[PDB]
Design a protein around this ligand. Structure first.
Ligand code: KAN
Ligand code: ADP
Ligand code: MG
Ligand code: MG
Length: 263
């Protein structure tokens, strides 16, 4: 248990000036490798999350599968060293969505980007998708996290509208209100922190440990959540739906939003 990376990987990143990310809120460790000819990225999770949607090991699988289907990083190196899952990947092409609009009067551009991701997602053949993240599987995983204290139940940034007075109240609810599901490709954590844009078009997706099959409303819900907080104006949510060309199923949007609360 040397705590981190193997020798080989150490040699591989030597040439680069390692810069530790400070944005990622997951349990994973992220490092930007500032190189001469390019930039590389190293992401790693410890053994506690092995098997879970946090496991970069799983993230690596989806990264490989999605190649030639979505703009994802190139899997440059992967290893399981000392109970850790370490992934070396290519820098996402484009500009981090969040950064690209971090301060602009571009509400419409954001919404457009979100709707493009959704349509784009729907066009992906999940017939051979490595993982399935159905509600059943997710709740089983949530249950696991809570039992092993792998979830931050006290100090997380919760929605101002989450009723529940404790973890199990919410778990129970999710377990009781499971909505009907209609599998489609799902990112798992669709936000301006995991999406890249270029020339006003999506150019890349990262953070894939939670990708796989799941209901259509999952990602839709995530977008709505960002939108309502990052651009206060009920009117901009209606536009997002106009672009997706569908009516909102509020009951399901609320559900998937709550589902993400303990992750
Ligand atoms: N625990 C680790 C996870 O922490 C965040 O996830 C949390 C969301 O950030 C919270 O939502 C807040 O941030 C949204 C932007 O996404 C805003 O729209 C919203 N108004 C805010 O309440 C939500 N309540 C809980 C969710 N677990 C990271 O995103 C995710 O990558 C990381 O794995
Ligand atoms: N391949 C990549 N190219 C560019 N930036 C990346 C890449 N991988 C990670 N990052 C950067 O690091 C941040 C955290 O990485 P992410 O995979 O989202 O970890 P977490 O699961 O904690 O959110 C991202 O918001 C992004 O800024
Ligand atoms: Mg992320
Ligand atoms: Mg993540």
């Amino acid at each position: 248990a040397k705590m981190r990376i193997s020798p080989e990987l150490k040699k591989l990143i030597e040439k680069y000036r390692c810069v530790k990310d400070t944005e990622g809120m997951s349990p994973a460790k992220v490092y930007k490798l500032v190189g001469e000819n390019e930039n590389l990225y190293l992401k790693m999770t410890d053994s506690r999350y092995k098997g879970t949607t946090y496991d970069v090991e799983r993230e690596k699988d989806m990264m490989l599968w999605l190649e030639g289907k979505l703009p994802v990083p190139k899997v440059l190196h992967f290893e399981r060293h000392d109970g850790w899952s370490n992934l070396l990947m290519s820098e996402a092409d484009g500009v981090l969505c969040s950064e690209e609009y971090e301060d602009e009067q571009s509400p419409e551009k954001i919404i457009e980007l979100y709707a493009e991701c959704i349509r784009l997602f729907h066009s992906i053949d999940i017939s051979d998708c490595p993982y399935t993240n159905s509600l059943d599987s997710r709740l089983a995983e949530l249950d696991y996290l809570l039992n092993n204290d792998l979830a931050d139940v006290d100090c997380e940034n919760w929605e101002e509208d989450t009723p529940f007075k404790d973890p199990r109240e919410l778990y129970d609810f999710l377990k009781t209100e499971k909505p009907e599901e209609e599998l489609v490709f799902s990112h798992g954590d669709l936000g301006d922190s995991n999406i890249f844009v270029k020339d006003g078009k999506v150019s890349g997706f990262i953070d894939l440990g939670r990708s796989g099959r799941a209901d259509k409303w999952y990602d839709i819900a995530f977008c709505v959540r960002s939108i309502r907080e990052d651009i206060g104006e009920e009117q901009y949510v209606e536009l997002f739906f106009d672009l997706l060309g569908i009516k909102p199923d509020w009951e399901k949007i609320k559900y998937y939003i709550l589902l993400d609360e303990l992750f």
